[PDB]
Amino acid sequence: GVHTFEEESTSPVPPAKLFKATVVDGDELTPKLIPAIQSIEIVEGNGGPGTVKKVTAVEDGKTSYVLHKIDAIDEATYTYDYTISGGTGFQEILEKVSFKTKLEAADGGSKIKVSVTFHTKGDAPLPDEVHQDVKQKSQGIFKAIEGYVLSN
Ligand SMILES: O=S(=O)(O)c1cccc2cccc(Nc3ccccc3)c12
Ligand SMILES: O=S(=O)(O)c1cccc2cccc(Nc3ccccc3)c12
Ligand SMILES: O=S(=O)(O)c1cccc2cccc(Nc3ccccc3)c12
Numbered sequence: 511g512v513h514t515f516e517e518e519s520t521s522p523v524p525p526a527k528l529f530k531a532t533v534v535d536g537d538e539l540t541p542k543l544i545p546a547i548q549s550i551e552i553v554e555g556n557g558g559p560g561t562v563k564k565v566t567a568v569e570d571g572k573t574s575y576v577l578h579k580i581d582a583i584d585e586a587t588y589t590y591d592y593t594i595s596g597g598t599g600f601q602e603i604l605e606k607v608s609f610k611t612k613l614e615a616a617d618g619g620s621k622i623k624v625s626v627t628f629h630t631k632g633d634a635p636l637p638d639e640v641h642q643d644v645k646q647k648s649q650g651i652f653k654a655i656e657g658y659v660l661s662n
């Protein structure tokens with residue numbers, strides 16, 4: 511089953527700085543800022559579309575990973591589209607979740623435009639708990655980096 515959500519939020523950080531921290535320096539900063547995430551390793555490609563990253567994390571003493579695949583990336587338009595799937599750490603009811611993110615200038619800061627598509631196994635509805643967990647983690651990473659950028 512396919513479940514789509516669209517959201518907008520704002521940041522006081524201007525788009526080039528926010529894009530650089532979250533997308534270009536994200537693989538270095540995320541493990542430093544999020545206790546559970548141990549590493550983000552490129553397993554295929556060189557940072558362009560098709561690049562696959564292995565994200566390893568620890569929870570309740572156990573180690574697992576998921577795969578992050580770049581669908582599109584363009585620095586000039588602050589565009590970053592990526593898919594989370596597979597590995598040993600992914601939500602059981604999900605085949606994949608695809609993200610389309612875009613920043614634009616707003617009021618000295620950034621407007622953030624997101625489109626999120628959950629692909630559930632078979633014809634399963636998206637449980638509230640799975641929506642909530644993917645959203646909290648997505649927000650957590652983005653907002654940990656944003657706070658870091660504000661501190662510097
Ligand atoms: O929980 S997931 O829904 O995959 C998830 C969804 C959205 C963003 C995520 C970012 C990093 C790690 C995740 N999970 C993860 C879990 C265990 C080990 C490694 C990564 C993320
Ligand atoms: O949502 S339901 O209407 O039961 C449902 C309806 C139709 C197909 C479903 C397939 C898998 C899991 C479900 N439920 C489920 C229940 C608890 C937790 C996670 C998924 C499905
Ligand atoms: O939560 S939001 O404020 O849009 C948000 C804020 C900042 C960064 C985000 C990155 C990915 C998805 C989001 N939203 C999202 C929406 C539904 C499900 C999962 C994530 C992000």
Ligand SMILES: O=S(=O)(O)c1cccc2cccc(Nc3ccccc3)c12
Nearest residue numbers: 642643644645646647648649650651653
């Ligand atoms: O902790 S929980 O709400 O369970 C939580 C569980 C899973 C993912 C989370 C992502 C961001 C923030 C949380 N809360 C949080 C609460 C206090 C300080 C920092 C983060 C998340």
Ligand SMILES: O=S(=O)(O)c1cccc2cccc(Nc3ccccc3)c12
Nearest residue numbers: 542543654655656657658659660661662
């Ligand atoms: O991760 S902390 O452990 O604080 C940390 C530890 C050691 C050095 C740090 C340098 C800059 C920012 C941090 N964190 C940070 C995160 C969000 C907002 C402001 C600062 C640093």
